[PDB]
Amino acid sequence: ERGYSFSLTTFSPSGKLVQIEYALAAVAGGAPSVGIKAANGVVLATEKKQKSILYDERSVHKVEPITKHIGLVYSGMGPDYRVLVHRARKLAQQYYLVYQEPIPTAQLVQRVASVMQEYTQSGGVRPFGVSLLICGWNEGRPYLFQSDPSGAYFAWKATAMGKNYVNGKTFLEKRYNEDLELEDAIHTAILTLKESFEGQMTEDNIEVGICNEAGFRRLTPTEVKDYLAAIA
């Protein structure tokens, strides 16, 4: 596997496509995002910490919408996130114009992942080094999927990508009861990030979206501040 690490179209002697793995390293070393599916909806969180006060925290939002009922959270090379979202909104849109119903979250990831897999079949295109968490509330059941640079889309109930992900998962499996409600879920989601965010959880440092029955929405700085104050 030593010399086969580079090319994404040459199987290693052990049948290991290494380059996809190294891309997954770029995900495993990115901003921590946490997802929890409460029986009332889907809650996503990620730390939007800038490198200095010179930044305008509200400029770039990580927890984002695709349609009215789907949103994304990423842990990896940012700019590679944006190219993903646009092909996501377009894909979410291209579904609407053809079928006229909001794209089921299963299909969107099936085609937001199939977007990823396109770049991992030829030499001359780097894999999308940003794992994605997709929340949606369709057909009356909250959904939380993770699409990876490798092209495989999971069906996570609650996970966390990015730095210190192993610890985050351990906090879950601990404080995750399949029978929570969205209100409690937000507290758990914030806490899971709290295990790694190196600092006070300022309202311009953590960005949270709630995928409930009515639709996904990036929480305004205050409401999180209402939430963050309670947890602290």
Partner 1 sequence: GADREVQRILLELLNQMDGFDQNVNVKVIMATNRADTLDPALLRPGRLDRKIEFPLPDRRQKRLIFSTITSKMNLSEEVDLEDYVARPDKISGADINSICQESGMLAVRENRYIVLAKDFEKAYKTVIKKDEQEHEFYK
Partner 2 sequence: SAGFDRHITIFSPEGRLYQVEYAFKAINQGGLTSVAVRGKDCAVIVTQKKVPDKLLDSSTVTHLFKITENIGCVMTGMTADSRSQVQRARYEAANWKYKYGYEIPVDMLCKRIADISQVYTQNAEMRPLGCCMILIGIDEEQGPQVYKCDPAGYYCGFKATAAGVKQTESTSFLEKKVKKKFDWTFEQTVETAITCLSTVLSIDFKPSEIEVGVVTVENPKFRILTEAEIDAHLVALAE
Partner 3 sequence: RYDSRTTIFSPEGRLYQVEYAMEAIGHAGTCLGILANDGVLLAAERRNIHKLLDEVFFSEKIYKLNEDMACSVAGITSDANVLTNELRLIAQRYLLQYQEPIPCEQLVTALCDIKQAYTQFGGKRPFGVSLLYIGWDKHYGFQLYQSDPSGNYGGWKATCIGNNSAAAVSMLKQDYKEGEMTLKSALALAIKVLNKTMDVSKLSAEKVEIATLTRENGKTVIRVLKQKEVEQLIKKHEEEEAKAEREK
Report whether 9 contacts 122 (CB < 8 A).
yes
Closest CA to 27 of 83, 79, 70, 74: 74
Neighbours of 232 (CB within 10 A): 9
Closest CA to 197 of 73, 47, 50: 47
Which of partner 2, partner 1, partner 3, none does residue 194 bind (CB under 5 to 8 Å by kind)? partner 1
**Stated length of the chain:** 232
**Residues in contact with partner 1, shown as a per-residue x/- string from 169 to 198 under the rule CB under 8 A:** -------------------------x-xxx
Which of partner 2, partner 1, partner 3, none does residue 199 bind (CB under 5 to 8 Å by kind)? partner 1
Question: What's the CA gap between 147 and 87, in Å, rounded?
Answer: 14
Neighbours of 23 (CB within 10 A): 26
Residue list 148-207, contact with partner 2 (CB under 8 A): none
Q: Which of 4, 29, 87, 164 binds partner 2 (CB under 8 A)?
A: 29
Question: What's the CA gap between 118 and 48, in Å, rounded?
Answer: 29
According to DSSP, the β-strands at 141-147 and 130-138 are antiparallel
Neighbours of 176 (CB within 10 A): 18
Which of partner 2, partner 3, partner 1, none does residue 169 bind (CB under 5 to 8 Å by kind)? partner 3
Q: Which of 87, 126, 218, 225 binds partner 2 (CB under 8 A)?
A: 126
Which of partner 1, partner 3, partner 2, none does residue 168 bind (CB under 5 to 8 Å by kind)? none
Report whether 149 contacts 116 (CB < 8 A).
yes
Is 56 or 198 the residue whose CB approaches partner 1 more closely?
198
Is 87 or 157 the residue whose CB approaches partner 3 more closely?
157
Contact between 75 and partner 1 per CB under 8 A: yes
Token pair belonging to 181: 């409600």
Question: What's the CA gap between 68 and 112, in Å, rounded?
Answer: 16
User: Which parts of this chain interact with partner 2 (CB under 8 A)?
Assistant: 5-7, 19, 22-29, 50, 52-60, 77-80, 82-83, 86, 119, 123-127, 129
User: Which parts of this chain interact with partner 1 (CB under 8 A)?
Assistant: 26, 29-31, 51, 75-79, 194, 196-199
User: Which parts of this chain interact with partner 3 (CB under 8 A)?
Assistant: 4, 8-17, 37, 106, 110, 113-114, 116-117, 120-123, 143-145, 150-152, 154-159, 169, 172-173, 176
